[PDB]
Design a binder for these strands. Structure first.
Ligand SMILES: O=c1ccn([C@@H]2O[C@H](COP(=O)(O)O)[C@@H](O)[C@H]2O)c(=O)[nH]1
Ligand SMILES: O=c1ccn([C@@H]2O[C@H](COP(=O)(O)O)[C@@H](O)[C@H]2O)c(=O)[nH]1
Ligand SMILES: O=c1ccn([C@@H]2O[C@H](COP(=O)(O)O)[C@@H](O)[C@H]2O)c(=O)[nH]1
Ligand SMILES: O=c1ccn([C@@H]2O[C@H](COP(=O)(O)O)[C@@H](O)[C@H]2O)c(=O)[nH]1
Ligand SMILES: O=c1ccn([C@@H]2O[C@H](COP(=O)(O)O)[C@@H](O)[C@H]2O)c(=O)[nH]1
Ligand SMILES: O=c1ccn([C@@H]2O[C@H](COP(=O)(O)O)[C@@H](O)[C@H]2O)c(=O)[nH]1
Ligand SMILES: O=c1ccn([C@@H]2O[C@H](COP(=O)(O)O)[C@@H](O)[C@H]2O)c(=O)[nH]1
Ligand SMILES: O=c1ccn([C@@H]2O[C@H](COP(=O)(O)O)[C@@H](O)[C@H]2O)c(=O)[nH]1
Ligand SMILES: O=c1ccn([C@@H]2O[C@H](COP(=O)(O)O)[C@@H](O)[C@H]2O)c(=O)[nH]1
Ligand SMILES: O=c1ccn([C@@H]2O[C@H](COP(=O)(O)O)[C@@H](O)[C@H]2O)c(=O)[nH]1
Ligand SMILES: O=c1ccn([C@@H]2O[C@H](COP(=O)(O)O)[C@@H](O)[C@H]2O)c(=O)[nH]1
Ligand SMILES: O=c1ccn([C@@H]2O[C@H](COP(=O)(O)O)[C@@H](O)[C@H]2O)c(=O)[nH]1
Ligand SMILES: O=c1ccn([C@@H]2O[C@H](COP(=O)(O)O)[C@@H](O)[C@H]2O)c(=O)[nH]1
Ligand SMILES: O=c1ccn([C@@H]2O[C@H](COP(=O)(O)O)[C@@H](O)[C@H]2O)c(=O)[nH]1
Ligand SMILES: [Ca+2]
Ligand SMILES: [Ca+2]
Ligand SMILES: [Ca+2]
Ligand SMILES: [Ca+2]
Ligand SMILES: [Ca+2]
Ligand SMILES: [Ca+2]
Ligand SMILES: [Ca+2]
Lengths: 72, 71, 71, 71, 71, 71, 71, 71, 71, 71, 71, 71, 71, 71
RNA sequence: UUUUUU
RNA sequence: UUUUUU
RNA sequence: UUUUUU
RNA sequence: UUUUUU
RNA sequence: UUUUUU
RNA sequence: UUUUU
RNA sequence: UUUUUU
């Protein structure tokens, strides 16, 4: 029953939340990932203290910076 | 009782995910892997006994995990 | 007297897990793995000489371990 | 869609390499590798939205990367 | 004399283990492995030139080691 | 222009090694390896745009590299 | 003039080990290995420019080295 | 339709296992692995067109397989 | 020009599979993997210019393969 | 039912071990490993259909196996 | 000089591929890999000094190769 | 009772090594390794029930082994 | 002196390459690798004591090698 | 006494190398490696009990080895 | 990409 | 589970 | 593709 | 290329 | 080289 | 041992 | 699938 890469695979093309280790989190459409847990987000927004401080049409995030990922 | 025995048996049960970052997550274990990445459902980010956040389902990268305790 | 010999023979006995962070755990070792992850039963988190929390059972990622001592 | 499909397609294109340590780099991606090391030509270090330095060509260890955004 | 030749010849000898953090353990080396995890007997934690603790036996995870010096 | 292509073409040329800590070394690239460890001759440790130290030859462990750039 | 060539080359010669945490080690190189672990003889630890400690022999874990320099 | 895609789709179906030796087995594929080992049910060993034997269940070492055909 | 380039650019095309045993199969290449296992559709086992057998779909373990030739 | 599921479920049951060399062994599977090496108790070497030898306990190198059959 | 140096320098040149079994292939080398798999264009299967077959292009699996000689 | 368990328990005991070749050895097991290489003392080569040779101590290459049987 | 030590030292010297197939090659060793593949210049395919063939340069897949002797 | 322990102990000594091809070499062991490749000086090829050839020094691919016995 | 499908 | 024992 | 150049 | 020197 | 000694 | 253990 | 693209 239901593992890391299953939820993530199934979350393809759906909106997710990427909480990083640093302190901030990104939000956007999950369009891809890899075994390292690297993820590609479309129409992403960099959220900080609850405020969208930056946006990117597409962004590739190194999975080692990832604290968690949640589907929205 | 090895780490993966305890974890695997905790499936569908409530567990505590103590992160090294300071805070912890509490929720229902529904999945995991060799890296100790874990999946919780009906999870709550807790900070000082304070539920400061909730998630329907959340995947936690195992290298952030400090420890895991089954409720 | 190798790391895994000592740890292994400590099965079902009381150990002292020192984390690199700051605190430590005290409890009966009931499991472990080649990554040095360890499972403790009747564990008590310790901060500055005082128990601050108790876990019936807890899996600690060996990655946060400084040392382990058979008490 | 996949991490590298994106990076690969960004060759000879402008990108933003967001560093873990705080700042970021902007330049034309002219190279990379499976470790995510990236090569930029005509790049600038960007601290607080401002250019603090320029490099005609610079190699960045993927070790220090947080993200890479095409364009 | 390679790293592990020196360590291997220190079995049952007194050694100094200088940790990364800021302190070190002094004691009799009775074991070790490839990761540089070491096992000391009749050991003592030394914080700023002072024994702040004592362990009859302790397995230190090699990852926390800065240096080992045969005394 | 893969990372190692640029680094290879840099043999016996001057390069700037930007470290993670906060400083940089400037010298002639006369060697390197798969880990991105590099060797520099007639090198200068530079702190704040200032030559704070010098070394006829130095080996910089790749793990401390933020980026290397050909001047 | 690759990293290990220079290091190998320095066997039995005087070197300076720059650790990432600020201090350095001066001594005669007498051994090493692939992880960059180094063995020094007649070594002294240096901080803010002064000798703070001496070791007849010392094995440094390499994972802590920034650079090594012959002489 | 990679090799394992076809084999995966043949689960619970009838296949022909052509062995390097010269004979073959015929049966219902009920399992397999990455080495190409295969498990057949109600299998009949065939030699020059003759059923020479029957096995309600048999595990064949893929090392002995030349080809598998979905019938 | 590389072995796998040719194979990959042969998908959905007719190929000639020469086995080491002595014979050969002809058919349309509908799949393969890095072990050089291959999948043919509408295949014909050939013994001295004669169609001795026919398989609508067959998977061959690359280990039995001597060479593969397009058209 | 994967190759190893079937084998594992046969522990302490009678099985047939068909070797590549033509003959076979019949016995009660009392063990095995991932290489497909298996152990049998009260085994019988068979050839042409007759017991030509008996062994109390025999370990067969998995590399010699053609197929294994339960019952 | 080294196997691949020689094999790499022969690209687009005529080579003789001597197979373990009873024969050889002659043709222009257009591609190869690390398994020593070779790709020949305008190839002729040679046997007992005579040409028995011609292939516009053929991929030879390295483990069937005995030796490769640059014409 | 896994393969390497039976072999380990036969140390300093009499065993029978059936070679895949054609003949077999008989002697006292004094050592082995992961490859199933084995070392025998007072070994006797046996062919067709006849001792054709004797060895004080012989080292046998594992991949030549068909089986091993404790006397 | 070790396998590769001897081989390395025979560079540019005449050697005998005894193949497993039976025949042997004689030539000047100009190169080799860890798989034990070797390159001979001015080579002679020797059979039953007769030079039945010659090659200016030839790469021999070490997989067919039985031995190599320095002349 | 593990396989390689016996082999190592035999250095600079007379041993017998029983090849799987049938014949056997004899000579002084002056080297070897983890593949079981061995080197003999002043070696003799023994075919059916009689010396058929001599070698000042020969390197034998451990792949053809059946066993080795210290004279 | 996780579904045994490398 | 480290005890060669995967 | 081997040339340290993954 | 073996020489710890990847 | 195998000896815990990469 | 295979059962994500 | 090989095309750096895991
Ligand atoms: O694209 C990549 C490559 C590596 N890593 C991280 O790098 C480390 C392992 O290095 P590599 O993989 O060898 C781990 O932290 C791993 O998560 C990533 O996150 N993404
Ligand atoms: O999905 C992943 C991938 C990696 N890691 C952790 O990140 C590091 C990746 O290293 P590797 O080696 O690449 C290790 O700490 C590993 O346990 C995870 O926790 N989850
Ligand atoms: O279950 C796990 C996975 C990883 N790690 C730690 O994560 C790092 C990389 O993963 P491992 O494969 O070494 C190491 O510090 C390792 O000890 C653990 O402690 N437990
Ligand atoms: O040139 C390099 C070599 C290594 N690493 C990083 O070092 C870690 C360990 O990989 P190494 O053992 O191959 C991983 O984070 C990997 O991404 C790089 O970023 N670039
Ligand atoms: O028992 C263990 C296991 C791992 N490590 C350390 O963990 C890292 C291995 O993780 P990687 O990353 O996979 C290295 O620093 C290694 O020394 C230890 O110190 N002790
Ligand atoms: O001489 C070395 C050996 C390792 N590493 C780094 O240590 C980690 C482990 O790689 P290896 O493989 O041990 C990676 O970050 C790698 O880049 C270096 O920087 N230099
Ligand atoms: O004796 C050792 C063992 C490992 N490492 C470091 O640990 C990491 C790899 O862990 P290993 O236990 O797989 C790399 O950074 C490597 O440089 C050392 O520095 N010294
Ligand atoms: O159950 C098994 C185990 C192994 N092998 C084959 O035998 C060899 C085992 O090697 P392993 O160490 O990767 C490989 O050829 C593998 O394909 C099988 O066919 N079936
Ligand atoms: O479908 C497969 C699976 C494995 N192998 C590989 O082939 C070798 C086994 O060849 P034979 O059979 O011994 C091993 O390297 C194995 O991994 C293949 O060629 N094809
Ligand atoms: O006890 C053993 C050891 C190896 N092998 C086979 O030998 C080859 C190499 O495996 P390892 O690696 O030595 C593979 O075919 C593997 O399945 C066995 O069958 N049994
Ligand atoms: O395209 C290929 C793939 C594999 N092999 C050989 O088949 C076996 C596969 O083992 P691994 O698995 O790659 C090895 O003998 C390898 O050299 C080839 O010759 N060519
Ligand atoms: O000392 C050794 C080393 C290897 N092998 C055998 O050689 C093969 C390993 O192949 P690789 O390929 O070397 C296996 O079948 C292993 O069983 C032995 O018998 N003894
Ligand atoms: O250039 C090569 C490549 C492979 N091999 C042999 O082919 C097999 C490759 O197996 P791996 O494992 O892929 C092994 O027998 C190896 O010794 C060679 O002799 N030379
Ligand atoms: O110099 C060598 C190299 C390999 N081998 C053997 O040939 C095979 C190589 O396969 P690996 O490269 O996949 C294994 O049996 C290995 O033990 C030797 O005997 N000598
Ligand atoms: Ca899958
Ligand atoms: Ca063990
Ligand atoms: Ca290269
Ligand atoms: Ca070397
Ligand atoms: Ca050793
Ligand atoms: Ca399991
Ligand atoms: Ca690709």
């Amino acid at each position: 029953a239901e593992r890391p890469l299953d939820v993530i695979h199934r979350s393809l093309d759906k909106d997710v939340l990427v909480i990083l280790k640093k302190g901030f989190e990104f939000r956007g459409r999950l369009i891809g990932y890899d075994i390292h847990l690297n993820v590609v987000l479309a129409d992403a927004e960099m959220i900080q203290d609850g405020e969208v401080v930056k946006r990117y049409g597409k962004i590739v995030i190194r999975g080692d910076n990832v604290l968690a990922i949640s589907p929205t």
